[PDB]
Design a protein around this motif. Structure first.
Motif, PDB file in Angstrom:
ATOM      1  N   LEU A 182      -7.763  11.782 -21.154  1.00  0.00           N
ATOM      2  CA  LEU A 182      -9.133  12.222 -21.295  1.00  0.00           C
ATOM      3  C   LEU A 182      -9.391  13.547 -20.582  1.00  0.00           C
ATOM      4  CD1 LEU A 182     -10.749   8.738 -20.929  1.00  0.00           C
ATOM      5  CD2 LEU A 182     -10.454  10.044 -23.036  1.00  0.00           C
ATOM      6  N   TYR A 183     -10.407  14.265 -21.035  1.00  0.00           N
ATOM      7  CA  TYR A 183     -10.875  15.526 -20.471  1.00  0.00           C
ATOM      8  C   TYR A 183     -11.941  15.370 -19.409  1.00  0.00           C
ATOM      9  CZ  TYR A 183     -13.178  20.169 -20.654  1.00  0.00           C
ATOM     10  OH  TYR A 183     -13.734  21.394 -20.370  1.00  0.00           O
ATOM     11  N   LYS A 184     -12.789  14.357 -19.588  1.00  0.00           N
ATOM     12  CA  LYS A 184     -13.955  14.164 -18.720  1.00  0.00           C
ATOM     13  C   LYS A 184     -14.236  12.696 -18.467  1.00  0.00           C
ATOM     14  CE  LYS A 184     -18.975  15.139 -18.421  1.00  0.00           C
ATOM     15  NZ  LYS A 184     -20.143  15.779 -19.079  1.00  0.00           N
ATOM     16  N   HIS A 241     -12.815   9.682 -28.484  1.00  0.00           N
ATOM     17  CA  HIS A 241     -11.577  10.392 -28.645  1.00  0.00           C
ATOM     18  C   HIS A 241     -11.746  11.857 -29.093  1.00  0.00           C
ATOM     19  CE1 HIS A 241     -10.694   6.014 -29.022  1.00  0.00           C
ATOM     20  NE2 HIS A 241      -9.961   6.406 -27.992  1.00  0.00           N
ATOM     21  N   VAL A 242     -12.822  12.181 -29.795  1.00  0.00           N
ATOM     22  CA  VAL A 242     -13.070  13.549 -30.220  1.00  0.00           C
ATOM     23  C   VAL A 242     -13.463  14.435 -29.027  1.00  0.00           C
ATOM     24  CG1 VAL A 242     -14.465  15.068 -31.629  1.00  0.00           C
ATOM     25  CG2 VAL A 242     -13.600  12.957 -32.622  1.00  0.00           C
ATOM     26  N   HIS A 243     -14.435  13.954 -28.285  1.00  0.00           N
ATOM     27  CA  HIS A 243     -14.922  14.678 -27.113  1.00  0.00           C
ATOM     28  C   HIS A 243     -14.141  14.424 -25.857  1.00  0.00           C
ATOM     29  CE1 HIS A 243     -17.862  15.821 -29.981  1.00  0.00           C
ATOM     30  NE2 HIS A 243     -18.305  14.564 -30.138  1.00  0.00           N
ATOM     31  N   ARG A 244     -13.196  13.477 -25.916  1.00  0.00           N
ATOM     32  CA  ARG A 244     -12.238  13.166 -24.882  1.00  0.00           C
ATOM     33  C   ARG A 244     -12.970  12.824 -23.559  1.00  0.00           C
ATOM     34  NH1 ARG A 244      -8.402  17.666 -23.616  1.00  0.00           N
ATOM     35  NH2 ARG A 244      -7.425  15.926 -22.548  1.00  0.00           N
ATOM     36  N   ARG A 245     -13.868  11.844 -23.642  1.00  0.00           N
ATOM     37  CA  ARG A 245     -14.593  11.431 -22.478  1.00  0.00           C
ATOM     38  C   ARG A 245     -14.818   9.928 -22.451  1.00  0.00           C
ATOM     39  NH1 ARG A 245     -19.416  11.076 -25.445  1.00  0.00           N
ATOM     40  NH2 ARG A 245     -20.026  13.108 -26.349  1.00  0.00           N
ATOM     41  N   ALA A 246     -15.122   9.438 -21.260  1.00  0.00           N
ATOM     42  CA  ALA A 246     -15.474   8.022 -21.079  1.00  0.00           C
ATOM     43  C   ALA A 246     -16.338   7.824 -19.871  1.00  0.00           C
ATOM     44  CB  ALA A 246     -14.212   7.142 -20.967  1.00  0.00           C
ATOM     45  N   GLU A 247     -17.051   6.693 -19.893  1.00  0.00           N
ATOM     46  CA  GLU A 247     -17.860   6.273 -18.746  1.00  0.00           C
ATOM     47  C   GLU A 247     -17.069   5.344 -17.873  1.00  0.00           C
ATOM     48  OE1 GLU A 247     -21.713   4.529 -19.794  1.00  0.00           O
ATOM     49  OE2 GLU A 247     -22.024   3.977 -17.578  1.00  0.00           O
ATOM     50  N   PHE A 248     -16.984   5.658 -16.622  1.00  0.00           N
ATOM     51  CA  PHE A 248     -16.350   4.834 -15.573  1.00  0.00           C
ATOM     52  C   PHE A 248     -17.374   3.915 -14.937  1.00  0.00           C
ATOM     53  CE2 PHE A 248     -15.871   4.237 -11.025  1.00  0.00           C
ATOM     54  CZ  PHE A 248     -14.622   3.758 -10.865  1.00  0.00           C
ATOM     55  N   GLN A 249     -17.024   2.626 -14.762  1.00  0.00           N
ATOM     56  CA  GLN A 249     -17.868   1.665 -14.053  1.00  0.00           C
ATOM     57  C   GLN A 249     -17.010   0.738 -13.200  1.00  0.00           C
ATOM     58  OE1 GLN A 249     -21.271   0.947 -17.662  1.00  0.00           O
ATOM     59  NE2 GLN A 249     -19.747  -0.617 -17.336  1.00  0.00           N
ATOM     60  N   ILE A 287     -16.345  14.272 -13.488  1.00  0.00           N
ATOM     61  CA  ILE A 287     -15.121  14.976 -13.079  1.00  0.00           C
ATOM     62  C   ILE A 287     -14.270  15.285 -14.286  1.00  0.00           C
ATOM     63  CG2 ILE A 287     -13.917  12.853 -12.567  1.00  0.00           C
ATOM     64  CD1 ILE A 287     -12.360  14.122 -10.412  1.00  0.00           C
ATOM     65  N   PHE A 288     -13.563  16.411 -14.235  1.00  0.00           N
ATOM     66  CA  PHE A 288     -12.742  16.845 -15.306  1.00  0.00           C
ATOM     67  C   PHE A 288     -11.229  16.674 -15.021  1.00  0.00           C
ATOM     68  CE2 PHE A 288     -16.050  18.325 -18.067  1.00  0.00           C
ATOM     69  CZ  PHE A 288     -17.101  18.522 -17.219  1.00  0.00           C
ATOM     70  N   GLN A 289     -10.439  16.561 -16.066  1.00  0.00           N
ATOM     71  CA  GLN A 289      -9.009  16.366 -15.969  1.00  0.00           C
ATOM     72  C   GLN A 289      -8.321  17.479 -15.186  1.00  0.00           C
ATOM     73  OE1 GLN A 289      -6.633  16.811 -19.618  1.00  0.00           O
ATOM     74  NE2 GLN A 289      -5.548  14.868 -19.230  1.00  0.00           N
TER      75      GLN A 289
END
Ligand code: CL
Ligand code: CL
Ligand code: CL
Ligand code: CL
Ligand code: CL
Ligand code: CL
Ligand code: CL
Ligand code: CL
Ligand code: CL
Ligand code: CL
Ligand code: CL
Ligand code: CL
Ligand code: CL
Ligand code: CL
Ligand code: CL
Ligand code: CL
Ligand code: CL
Ligand code: CL
Ligand code: CL
Ligand code: CL
Lengths: 169, 169, 169, 169, 169, 169, 169, 169, 169, 169, 169, 169
Positions: F113-115, F75-83, F160-162
């Motif tokens: 998310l950002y990324k 949540h801080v870096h606003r990212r996640a891994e997609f699978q 990819i970015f938002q």
């Protein structure tokens, strides 16, 4: 006609719960009559492995007919309190006498107790007669010891010893 | 027509949950009406073996017809609060009177209480009449003690003592 | 056609789980939409007896038609947040108005609250119209308070007081 | 003179407990002011690892001088509520401004929030002045939102966005 | 001379335990007087976070001088029971009046209650005088409601409303 | 033909357990492939309410067809891994593209998310083509990062970015 | 001057808690910096026996000087992430190089890993120089992977293999 | 010389443990004499809040001098068993009489019991004399009810009623 | 004819329990053969998530035919013990060879182990022949290492390395 | 006719419970005969994984016919107590001999014990004959060691050693 | 000079933790060397009453000098693994021989084992010499069984039997 | 010189732990000698309230001098096993005789047992002499019943009955 005892099982608690005067033989479990079924089952669960009590169902021709028990079992003083309740329809037919003698045989020939005692209402002449024929002797009076149906009542304590029981079978 | 009391069992809670004004007789369990069924069952479970309460189902010709109870049972001061709710269709037929007298008999002849008391809306003339015929006397007014349907309401406290009840059966 | 409220029961959670926008009325339970059924049931279990919330199913002609609730109930400040969701097919027929008025009646006539408030999207003209007809007044704007479907959105807070509600029934 | 923030530690709770208006910044923990110390410590324990809050002690020249915090942290909407309390003797000296700017820097430069908001009494001109100088803008009025010292009071909500904060440092 | 209230802390329980008539203000915790210290501490622990009670130590010139409390707090009906006990040496000096007014101020100006009530022995003229000067009015008599020192005693219920308290400060 | 996502439910775990390469999308739950069903269900239970993951079943014409998920949500870096994993028979028909776009829409339009990033085998040309058409760009190579079927393999990270996703829908 | 590693002990957590940038090496434990001491100790307790991590204190002439660790240890793929933090005063003196070589020796000669990797800010030329001298090679760039002090930053991943390390000692 | 009762506290258990005949007054806790201190403390802990017992330390001129208690308290039948033990050096000086009268006053004037009873060895003429002077009357003999020092012994039950006690102070 | 491995599931334990020599492959779980079914299920439950073991059912034409497993998995030394049991009717048909090769493929191509070893009775020529054809080499003799059917027996340890297995497929 | 042993399973406890003299082979579990079924099942549960006992059902032509067991298994002294009970109808037909020899084979050929011993009533000539034919030798007499059916009885201890058993098969 | 063994106590764990090669004798407790002190103490706690191990401190002239132990104790096969570590300064002085002989005496004369075995590095000529003088014989070689300091190493298994030990004292 | 018994207290366990042959009197607690102190304390804790044992410290002139105990107490058969250990320096002075007579007096005059028995090594002439002088008679020989210091040893069982003990004091 056969009469036998068997242990009071958790699956027999609906039977116990529907007996009219069941509180009178569970006085050390609860004081307020009209306990709920789950109150009774929780108390049963709490007393598994309790060495101070052994409770039995009385069977007559293979049907549940009452309860007999030895409670307040004290191993140092080698004594216990005997209590019995018989379903009303099975009363007056000699069942209480036969069930009581099985429980006496359990206390004196199996558990090796020295003394069995019981408490009975002073006005219950029928019960006192049955206990005297089994060898119980009046020990004393407990004055105004129970409040029952709106008035204090007197109880009698009765007792029998192992030597007497074994000498008379 | 028979009327009897029996203990409120865990399996009777769906019945209790569907009674219209059930919150009014469970005021010491919860304050927000419209509790969920599992909220009610969890509270029931939490109060098993609670010596301050005894709750009963009222049966009429073998059908559940309401609830009667003794709550806030205080053993030192020997008093309790009486509360009753009767399903609407069973109202006006003498059931509340008969059920109340059974609960009074339980409090005074079985539990050995000295005093029973109840609270009733000051405008509930029908209820006050029934309680007066049973021997309850008005004790005092609790001014703006309940907020009900958008306004504060006045309640009356009523009481009866064991000596009066026993002297009149 | 009848409309009634009933408490949200644990057995109603499959219904809640299948409602399209159920996350919008459980914002204080979870933030990530698309929670699993066991996530929802565990949260429900964790909130039994929570005095800060009361949630209801809305019934219409005896069928589940939506949810209405009072959350963030604060007893000191005597206020709560009102939220509602109606199944899409039951929309536009006056159900939201009737369900909302029942929940208002619960908050002001039963729970004795002083203030009810709600949040609505600023672009939801239909909703704002319904709330204004019920007596809610616009209180303020929360600027970019929610990120919904890819952009920040503005919300309006609306409120009504007990004196107004009681004066107009 | 140095001003720094540090995390609110369990060993700092006696300090928090003795602050005069500590309930005003723990409104989501408890509603009844004058909680006991063990009530406060139990709540602290229950909120370890709670991602919705970060609370700090404000240090001035190495002495505890107040508390600042970000609560109701919502990661989806990227917002939080800012709250501060400064010990009275440290008031009027520029400490609130310096502590608030550190907490803003934490929310916008460390936690990556989009929006910070706060609530202030409408009559607290000194506070509103300080928040406006930090870049907060009035968002709306919450009418009779708090009952304080015997009367309902109006609060103002104020907010600031990350783009504004970053553009002005 | 200063008088202040502070929350009853777990570390204050030895003080409470040594007060002569402490059972009279903990009647809803226990019925048998002369509870052990660990009985009292366990009950305190069980009631942390209980929204139905707030208990305070009364301080006079920085020394513990008694206890005041609001119990049976009902948020729907917006009422509570007030109770006080003052160490005997601090009696007759105006402390009870000053402590009671602080607790009234807490109930009406902080907790936002509508009604405060108390129970007092009918023969305690000194207490009744103090409560009347604070604005309490006699509500009713509870006949033989307490068994104290060998006989049943009559109690008086007294009450005051928020509008009266706020109108007179 | 319809394609939709729904949350991965506890009752869907038999489906997950029978998917051929299910370990590849649960790498942060367990390392040894061929876990037992109760191992998988216990891990699911342990991760209820875990804010770092959201897992979904992919439905095609109302039948379970695969799994898509966002893990390692920060949540801080606003990212996640997609699978993603698609049942083999549903491969080559455009389902992976449609399911991936739904999960992207969830990450960027719902979770804010950002990324988003993913890892793919460097030799999986078909997968890389699908991800590039969705807007993912190659970020870097992870050299000998996985031991698969007897040899170390190289993986590519893609991201990819938002702003890109929102600008292209 | 001696440099040695020792396991990170529970009694060393006050040291860890006071290190300036300790969150950067505990990113998989918590995301919100400025955790409380009891938050850190509870996480430590939760990770006892965790085979995915080994954390060490770096000692220099018998004084605590930093932390080095191997996290995300994957036994199938035989890899781990290396992370280090050195107290500022111990920087620029060759300690990071000596501590890093001890941790590399632990990963490759004791744990039998195949690959070690690390992440470093792209602008940290001093760090990148130290890692290159130890045999790490740049693997790839993670674009805008961290939000630090108000802006997204780029990181570089670096790696080294066991064969290289063993061939060069 | 002062004599007072105080509750038996957990910190008084070393005193109880060192009293010579302490088992005789804890017969319902344990049967095998010579229990360990932690056996006694665990039983004490198990009986906190037990409404069937109240145990007191007897103080004489501020020194622990014995124990007095009411056990087997039955609220329905309004009775209890009285038991006392006095340290040997405090015997023959009138302490047992004074302590017994305090415990009687507690049972009849505080707890509102109807009947108190006790058991005494038939050969303990000194004890029987003291109990008769306090108003106890012999109720009955329990024949061979205790095995003490190698032989069965006879006990006497004695009782007194509330009306007698109150009529004579 | 197909042969496949699948994880040993909790629902497969009745099968395991009825295999004749099942204790020989669960030597690290229990020592006394003839364990009860609930003993076996409790051990299974205790070993969920145990990284030191992976156990499989061997399927032949879709029917359970035996068990194969890797136990004592050591990640530092990269080794494990291989064990197999085949139902008697499936013996002599090439199933053990095919099942063993699948388990070897799991250990060397999936788990990335360096060494697999097994123990076999020195007199089991058939087994030793099968293991030698799979590439196992005799490592040493364990003299009188097992007491089986009344006498001590000698076992042989056999081993194979990953490089050999991978070089020969 | 086949005779085999199998482990005593939890699902076999109804069988055990209905055997007439089952207490005689569970003397180390309970002393009061006529235990309830849930008492027996709870003891079984408490003894899972107990290395001091192994209990078996005796099967004859696939029907439950009795119980045989090794209890008080001592690994240092390499000994155990053998006990058997056979359903009455299966008595006198050679089953006890065949079942006993299987249990002896388990103790001496599987568990590697040095000594097996048993206790038998001195008057049970039939049993003593069977044990002597199996190789047991009388070791000593335990005088008045059991109270059975109203009188003390003498028991004989019998024993056999592994060397004798193995030398005679 | 005296040498004695004593049980490894929980208070001796700081000593164990500071021994250089302590992991080598706790290989069945943990695999990653450099465990934390609380990791070691938690494992010790988990193994209280574990019949598979007995660990001892070696005392020399009353000072802790090393550890000796019997692990993997198997009661059926009557065997155990012997392991020893001696503090470096106590090496070369005959202590290992004397400590080993005490542990052998414990295994063969106290625990009644049949076989003791150990594992030693093939290059540790000094150790092998000491074990041969004590009567251990080389049993076999375990090829590349341990990865130590960057390379696989060969170990030798050595064993001795009870008959040999007892025949030579 | 005084000799007295007192209960074995938890604080006496360091004394018990340092006695040379303490395992010989705790054979039913543990089999492997050289248990750790926390192993012994955990067993003590597990046996609080165990009615099958009573253990005592023997005091001589106020100093701990040994242990005496009654274990395997069977209330049905009214028997127990007597065991004693005396610190070596207190041996040969008549202490064992005096301590044994106190324990006999406890078993026969306090616990009301019928039979006490003990086991002694057949070669311990001094012990057998002491037991015979106390009235114990040889009952039988247990052949090769204990493995002690490398060889099987024979034990003698000795017994005494209550009637004999009481008839001779
Ligand atoms: Cl008579
Ligand atoms: Cl009467
Ligand atoms: Cl009236
Ligand atoms: Cl009103
Ligand atoms: Cl408006
Ligand atoms: Cl936007
Ligand atoms: Cl503004
Ligand atoms: Cl008045
Ligand atoms: Cl690309
Ligand atoms: Cl490779
Ligand atoms: Cl590079
Ligand atoms: Cl940026
Ligand atoms: Cl008299
Ligand atoms: Cl070979
Ligand atoms: Cl052999
Ligand atoms: Cl013989
Ligand atoms: Cl006899
Ligand atoms: Cl050799
Ligand atoms: Cl003799
Ligand atoms: Cl021998």
């Amino acid at each position: 006609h056969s009469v036998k005892l068997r242990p009071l099982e958790r699956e027999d608690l609906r039977y116990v719960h529907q007996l009219d005067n069941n509180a009178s033989v569970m006085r050390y479990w609860f004081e307020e009559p009209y306990e709920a079924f789950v109150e009774l089952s929780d108390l049963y669960d709490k007393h598994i492995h309790d060495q101070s009590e052994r409770r039995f169902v009385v069977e007559c021709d293979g049907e549940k007919a009452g309860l007999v028990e030895l409670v307040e079992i004290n191993h140092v003083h080698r004594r216990a309190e005997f209590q019995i309740i018989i379903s009303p329809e099975y009363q007056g037919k000699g069942l209480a006498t036969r069930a009581a003698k099985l429980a006496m045989d359990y206390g004196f020939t199996v558990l090796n107790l020295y003394k069995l005692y019981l408490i009975v209402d002073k006005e219950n002449e029928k019960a006192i007669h049955i206990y005297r024929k089994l060898g119980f002797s009046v020990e004393g009076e407990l004055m105004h010891e129970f409040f029952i149906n709106g008035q204090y009542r007197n109880a009698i304590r009765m007792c029998i010893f192992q030597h007497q029981y074994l000498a008379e079978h």
